[PDB]
C-alpha cells in the first residue's frame, strides 16, 4: 503493498507514462521485461561502493594532453583549499592522489576523514585517481582558471537508500481477415491492398499482398496469405510487418517469435500507425493506443518451439577491398556470397564483422546455425580493441539477431564512464533497434547508469525525452526507466523529482506566452509585465528552493532573478530565465541562465551537440583543440526543451545592427573592433584572436561534415573573450560560413594571405584530416542520427552526403585539397547567401 502503491504514482509522474496499464499491450513482453530486470538491477545495486557512488567521482584514465601539459610549465599545479573564509594555496604534483594531497594539508596546519568538494559544485574529488585525471580539473587548466576546493564530510550512503523489493517443418501463414478505420481521409474513391512482409532487420524474407478492394471504412478479405519460408525456417525478432497501400498509408509489425521463443498463434487486432505524410519508428512492435483514431487490423495465426583450407590470393584482395570499406557501401551478391565462403577468414577482421554478418542468410535454420558456431569462436573478435564505430555499427537497424547484437554490448562493457558519456544518447536512440523490450544493451545502460550517478542522470532525462515525445518507442522505454528509478536510489528520486517539477512549471509559463504576440516580431510591454508576475507567482509557493540543472547535474540551481528574466525576441516565444546559485560556497554573484524554448524538436539539437563534442574529443587524440562551444541542450517533451546561455556572447548579426543594423548592408572591419572594445589588454585582445582563429576553424570543419553549415548571421555567436560558436541546428549554397568580417580578423581582405590565416587553414586541415581517420564513426553516428532523430528520409542520399564530404575513398592530398577549395567557395561569394536570407522574404 500500500505505501508500495505511493512509491508507483510516484514513479509514473517521474517517468511521464503508467507502466501498469495495460491497454495497449496484446501481450505481456512489457510486463515480463519489467520482471526480467529486477535481478540486473539489484545486481548492480548491491555490488555498488557506498561512498564512491555518493560522491560519483568525475574521471579519465586518458592522457593528458600536449596543449594542457603545456600550460603547466613548472610540472606542479596551485589549488587553493577552504574551511570558512580560512584558506591556502598548495602546490601539487601532477600525479597527487587526493587522501595524499589530504597528507600534506594536515601537515602543514594543526601543529576523523573529511573530503574536497569543488566550490559551488555538486562535485567531489576523491577515490585512488591522480588529480590530472579528475576531469574538473582539466576543465580548469584549458580555461586558465584556478582551482578552488572547500573541505567538507563526506555525504550519508543512507540517503542512496534502495527501497525494499519483494517481486515443424510447414510453409508459414497468416489470415488477413479485414481492416477498419472509422472516418475516410481523401474521400474520392480509391482503391486499397495489405502488404505483409516478414522482416529481419530491414532484410525482407519473403512477402505477399492482397488482391485489392475498394477503400471503405470496413474490408474483409478472409484470405489466407502462404509464404514460402518455413515455419522451422524464421529467426528470432523477425517481424511481421503488415502495410497498408493506395501509397503506404499505415503499417504495423508483430514479433513473429515471442520473447518466449514461441511461435506467435491466434487473433490479433491490430492498430496502426499512419503515415507521416528509411526510420526507426517502422520497426517497432508497438501498436498505436489511440484506438478510436487509427486503422486497424485483424489476422489469425495457427500453424510450437524451437530455441580449413588455403585461400587463393586474388580473392584475398576481393576480399580485403570489401572489408575496407566505408559502412554504407553496399554489397553486391557478389561480395556477399564471398563474405560467406570464406567467413573463416573474414573472422579474422573485426572490421568485417558487420559486413559479414549482413552476408548470412538469416531465413534458413541451418545458415544462422553455422552463423552461430561461427561466433563460437570469437578468440580475434574478443581479443581486439574496442572500436566503438564497429561496435555501433552492430547495434544499427541492420542487425536483428540477439547474438550479433550481443557481442558488440560485450565490446562495450569494456568502456569507462568518461565515454559511456560521450556515446551514451546514440546508445539509448540504439535501443529502437533492438527486435525485444528487454536486450542486453538495455541491460547495460541499465548497469552503467545505476553504477554512476552521472550516467545515471544523463539516462533519465534521455529516456524522459524519448517517452514524452514517442509514442512508437515510449512503452519500452518507460520500463527502462522505471527499472533505473527503482535502483537509482532516493537521493537521486527526490532530485529528479524537484527537476521534474520546475521545468513542468516553467514549460506550463513559456506556452502560455506564445498565446499573447502571436507573430508580431516585437513583443508588447504587456508580455514581459505578465512574464514577470506570473514567475513571481511561481516562486512565491510552488517552485522548489533549489534544484539540478538537467544538462549540468553538479549545478543547484536556486532562485530566480526575476529581474533579469524575459521573453525572447523570436517568431517562437523562448525564455530568458536566470537563476541564483543555490550553493553559497560559489565564488560568484553570476547567475545560471537558461532559456526554454517550444516549438523546436530539440532532439535533433541534442544529437547535434553529441556528435561536437565526439568530435573535440576525436581532436583530443592528436593533441588538438578547437574551442568549440557545445552548450547544454536537453529535450523534455514535445517540441520543447531547455538550454544552456553562453555567459558573455553576442550574435554575429547584431555586431552588425549595432553599427547599421540596416535592413541589410554589410560591413568587414566590424567584427575586429568589437573585440578591441571587449579587450581591456591589447595582448588580451591577441588571446580573443587566438581563441577566435580556433573556434572558427572548429566550427568551419565539424558544420561542412554535417553538412549544417550554410547558415544565418543570426545563428553564429561569439564570446567576449574570442569563442565563436554556431546555435540552433532544429532550423546557391555555401559549404560553410567564412565571411570577410572573419577575414579581416585573419589579416586579409578578399583574395590575400597573412600570417593567423594561414594557421587557420593549418589548423582546418588538421582538424579535417583527423576526423577522417574516424570516417566510419562518425558515418555510423550520423547514420543513426538520421534513422532516429528525424522525420523521414531516403536511407541513400541522405546519409550519403556525409561520405562525399569526408572525401572517402582519398588519400590524404587529394583531400585537403578538397577542402582548401571548399574555403576559395567562400571567398568567391563573401557576403552573397548571407545577404540572400533576407530577400526571399518574399520568395
Ligand atoms: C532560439 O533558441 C535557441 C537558442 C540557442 C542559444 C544557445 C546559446 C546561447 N547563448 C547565448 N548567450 C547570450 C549572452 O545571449 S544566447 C544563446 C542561444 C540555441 N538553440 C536554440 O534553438 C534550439
Same mark, same amino acid.
Given at each position: 503493498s500500500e505505501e508500495s502503491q505511493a512509491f508507483q504514482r510516484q514513479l509514473t509522474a517521474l517517468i511521464g507514462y503508467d507502466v501498469t496499464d495495460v491497454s495497449n499491450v496484446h501481450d505481456d513482453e512489457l510486463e515480463f521485461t519489467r520482471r526480467g530486470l529486477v535481478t540486473p538491477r539489484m545486481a548492480e545495486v548491491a555490488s555498488r561502493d557506498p561512498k564512491l557512488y555518493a560522491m560519483h567521482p568525475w574521471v579519465t584514465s586518458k592522457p593528458l594532453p600536449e596543449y594542457l601539459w603545456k600550460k603547466i610549465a613548472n610540472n606542479c599545479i596551485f589549488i587553493v583549499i577552504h574551511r570558512s573564509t580560512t584558506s591556502q594555496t598548495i602546490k601539487v604534483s601532477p600525479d597527487d592522489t587526493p587522501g595524499a594531497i589530504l597528507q600534506s594539508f594536515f601537515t602543514k596546519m594543526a601543529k576523523q576523514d573529511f573530503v574536497l568538494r569543488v566550490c559551488g559544485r555538486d562535485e567531489y574529488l576523491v577515490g585512488e585517481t591522480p588529480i590530472k585525471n579528475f576531469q574538473w580539473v582539466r576543465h580548469c587548466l584549458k580555461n586558465g582558471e584556478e582551482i578552488h576546493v572547500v573541505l567538507d564530510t563526506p555525504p550519508d550512503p543512507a540517503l542512496d537508500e534502495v527501497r525494499k523489493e519483494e517481486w515443424c517443418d510447414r510453409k508459414f501463414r497468416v489470415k488477413i481477415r479485414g481492416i477498419d478505420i472509422?472516418?475516410?481521409?481523401?474521400?474520392?474513391?480509391?482503391?486499397?491492398?495489405?502488404?505483409?512482409?516478414?522482416?529481419?532487420?530491414?532484410?525482407?524474407?519473403?512477402?505477399?499482398?492482397?488482391?485489392?478492394?475498394?477503400?471503405?471504412?470496413?474490408?474483409?478479405?478472409?484470405?489466407?496469405?502462404?509464404?514460402?519460408?518455413?515455419?522451422?525456417?524464421?529467426?528470432?525478432?523477425?517481424?511481421?510487418?503488415?502495410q497498408i497501400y493506395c501509397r503506404l498509408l499505415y503499417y504495423v509489425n508483430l514479433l513473429l517469435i515471442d520473447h518466449r521463443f514461441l511461435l506467435r498463434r491466434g487473433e490479433y487486432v491490430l492498430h496502426m500507425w499512419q503515415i507521416s505524410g528509411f526510420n526507426a519508428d517502422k520497426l517497432t512492435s508497438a501498436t498505436n493506443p489511440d484506438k478510436e483514431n487509427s486503422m486497424s487490423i485483424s489476422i489469425l495465426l495457427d500453424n510450437h518451439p524451437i530455441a580449413r583450407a588455403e585461400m587463393p590470393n586474388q580473392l584475398r584482395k576481393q576480399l580485403e577491398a570489401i572489408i575496407a570499406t566505408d559502412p554504407l557501401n553496399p554489397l553486391t551478391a557478389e561480395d556477399k556470397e564471398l563474405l560467406w565462403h570464406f567467413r573463416y577468414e573474414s573472422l579474422k577482421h573485426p572490421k568485417a564483422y558487420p559486413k559479414l554478418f549482413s552476408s548470412v542468410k538469416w531465413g534458413q535454420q541451418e545458415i544462422v546455425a553455422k552463423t552461430y558456431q561461427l561466433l563460437a569462436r570469437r578468440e580475434v573478435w574478443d581479443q581486439s580493441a574496442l572500436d566503438v564505430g564497429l561496435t555501433m555499427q552492430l547495434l544499427d537497424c541492420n542487425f536483428s539477431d540477439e547474438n550479433v547484437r550481443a557481442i558488440a554490448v560485450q565490446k562495450l562493457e569494456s568502456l569507462e564512464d568518461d565515454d559511456v558519456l560521450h556515446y551514451l544518447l546514440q546508445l539509448v536512440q540504439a535501443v529502437k533497434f533492438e527486435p525485444y523490450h528487454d536486450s542486453a544493451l538495455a541491460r547495460f545502460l541499465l548497469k552503467r547508469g545505476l553504477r554512476n550517478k552521472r550516467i545515471g542522470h544523463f539516462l533519465f532525462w534521455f529516456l524522459r525525452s524519448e517517452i514524452a515525445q514517442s509514442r512508437h518507442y515510449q512503452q519500452r522505454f518507460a520500463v527502462i526507466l522505471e527499472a533505473y528509478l527503482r535502483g537509482c536510489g532516493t537521493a537521486m528520486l527526490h532530485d529528479f523529482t524537484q527537476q521534474v517539477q520546475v521545468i513542468e512549471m516553467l514549460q506550463k509559463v513559456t506556452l502560455d506566452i506564445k498565446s499573447l504576440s502571436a507573430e508580431k516580431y516585437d513583443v508588447s510591454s504587456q508580455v514581459i509585465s505578465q512574464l514577470k508576475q506570473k514567475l513571481e507567482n511561481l516562486?512565491?509557493?510552488?517552485?522548489?528552493?533549489?534544484?539540478?540543472?538537467?544538462?549540468?547535474?553538479?549545478?543547484?540551481?536556486?532562485?530566480l532573478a526575476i529581474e533579469k528574466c524575459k521573453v525572447m525576441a523570436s517568431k517562437k516565444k523562448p525564455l530568458w530565465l536566470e537563476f541564483k546559485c543555490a550553493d553559497p560556497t560559489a565564488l560568484s554573484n553570476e547567475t545560471i541562465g537558461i532559456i526554454f524554448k517550444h516549438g523546436d524538436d530539440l532532439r535533433q539539437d541534442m544529437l547535434i551537440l553529441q556528435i561536437l563534442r565526439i568530435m573535440e574529443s576525436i581532436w583530443e587524440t592528436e593533441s588538438l583543440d578547437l574551442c568549440l562551444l557545445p552548450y547544454g541542450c536537453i529535450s523534455t517533451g514535445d517540441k520543447i526543451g531547455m538550454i544552456e546561455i553562453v555567459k558573455d556572447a553576442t550574435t554575429i548579426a547584431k555586431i552588425q545592427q549595432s553599427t547599421v543594423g540596416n535592413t541589410g548592408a554589410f560591413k568587414d572591419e566590424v567584427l575586429n573592433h568589437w573585440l578591441k572594445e571587449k579587450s581591456p589588454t591589447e595582448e588580451k585582445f591577441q588571446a580573443a584572436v587566438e581563441?577566435?582563429?580556433?573556434?572558427?576553424? !572548429?566550427?568551419?570543419?565539424?558544420? &561542412? *561534415? =554535417?553538412?549544417?553549415?550554410?547558415?544565418?548571421?543570426?545563428?553564429?555567436?561569439?564570446?567576449? @573573450?574570442?569563442?565563436?560558436?554556431?546555435?540552433?541546428? !532544429?532550423?546557391?549554397?555555401?559549404? &560553410? *560560413? =567564412?565571411?570577410?568580417?572573419?577575414?579581416?580578423?585573419?589579416?586579409?581582405?578578399?583574395?590575400? @594571405?597573412?600570417?593567423?590565416?594561414?594557421?587557420?587553414?593549418?589548423?582546418?586541415?588538421?582538424?579535417?584530416?583527423?576526423?577522417?581517420?574516424?570516417?566510419?564513426?562518425?558515418?555510423?553516428?550520423?547514420?543513426?542520427?538520421?534513422?532516429?532523430?528525424?522525420?523521414?528520409?531516403?536511407?541513400?542520399?541522405?546519409?550519403e552526403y556525409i561520405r562525399d564530404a569526408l572525401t572517402v575513398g582519398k588519400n590524404e592530398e587529394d583531400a585537403k585539397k578538397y577542402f582548401l577549395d571548399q574555403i576559395e567557395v567562400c571567398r568567391d561569394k563573401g557576403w552573397t547567401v548571407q545577404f540572400n536570407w533576407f530577400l526571399h522574404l518574399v520568395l
Open positions: 472509422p472516418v475516410l481521409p481523401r474521400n474520392t474513391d480509391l482503391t486499397v491492398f495489405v502488404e505483409a512482409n516478414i522482416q529481419h532487420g530491414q532484410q525482407v524474407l519473403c512477402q505477399r499482398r492482397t488482391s485489392p478492394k475498394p477503400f471503405t471504412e470496413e474490408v474483409l478479405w478472409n484470405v489466407w496469405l502462404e509464404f514460402s519460408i518455413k515455419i522451422k525456417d524464421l529467426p528470432k525478432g523477425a517481424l511481421l510487418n503488415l516562486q512565491n509557493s510552488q517552485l522548489p528552493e533549489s534544484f539540478r540543472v538537467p544538462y549540468d547535474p553538479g549545478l543547484k540551481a536556486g532562485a581563441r577566435f582563429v580556433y573556434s572558427c576553424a !572548429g566550427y568551419c570543419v565539424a558544420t &561542412f *561534415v =554535417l553538412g549544417i553549415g550554410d547558415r544565418h548571421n543570426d545563428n553564429i555567436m561569439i564570446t567576449e @573573450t574570442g569563442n565563436l560558436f554556431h546555435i540552433d541546428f !532544429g532550423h546557391e549554397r555555401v559549404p &560553410f *560560413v =567564412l565571411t570577410p568580417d572573419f577575414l579581416f580578423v585573419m589579416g586579409t581582405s578578399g583574395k590575400k @594571405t597573412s600570417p593567423h590565416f594561414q594557421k587557420f587553414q593549418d589548423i582546418c586541415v588538421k582538424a579535417y584530416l583527423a576526423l577522417r581517420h574516424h570516417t566510419n564513426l562518425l558515418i555510423i553516428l550520423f547514420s543513426m542520427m538520421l534513422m532516429t532523430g528525424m522525420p523521414q528520409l531516403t536511407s541513400k542520399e541522405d546519409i
